[PDB]
Design a protein around this ligand. Sequence first.
Ligand SMILES: *C(=O)c1cnc2ccccc2n1
Ligand SMILES: *C(=O)c1cnc2ccccc2n1
Ligand SMILES: [Cl-]
Ligand SMILES: [Zn+2]
Ligand SMILES: [Zn+2]
Ligand SMILES: [Zn+2]
Lengths: 8, 10
Amino acid sequence: XAXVXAXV
Amino acid sequence: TXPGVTXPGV
DNA sequence: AGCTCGT
DNA sequence: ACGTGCT
Ligand SMILES: *C(=O)c1cnc2ccccc2n1
Ligand SMILES: *C(=O)c1cnc2ccccc2n1
Ligand SMILES: [Cl-]
Ligand SMILES: [Zn+2]
Ligand SMILES: [Zn+2]
Ligand SMILES: [Zn+2]
């Protein structure tokens, strides 16, 4: 849920 | 999920 | 109750 | 170095 590297 | 049963995700 | 990735 | 979004 976070998008800090993936943003899922 | 869904909604319902968002996504995932969002 | 109901889930998911890496830049 | 980080949790998200309604039925
Ligand atoms: C989004 O909040 C979120 C939280 N945990 C995870 C674990 C593994 C892959 C993706 C994820 N996304
Ligand atoms: C994005 O690819 C990414 C990768 N590793 C992490 C570890 C801890 C917090 C955030 C992260 N983001
Ligand atoms: Cl991981
Ligand atoms: Zn509830
Ligand atoms: Zn990882
Ligand atoms: Zn976590």
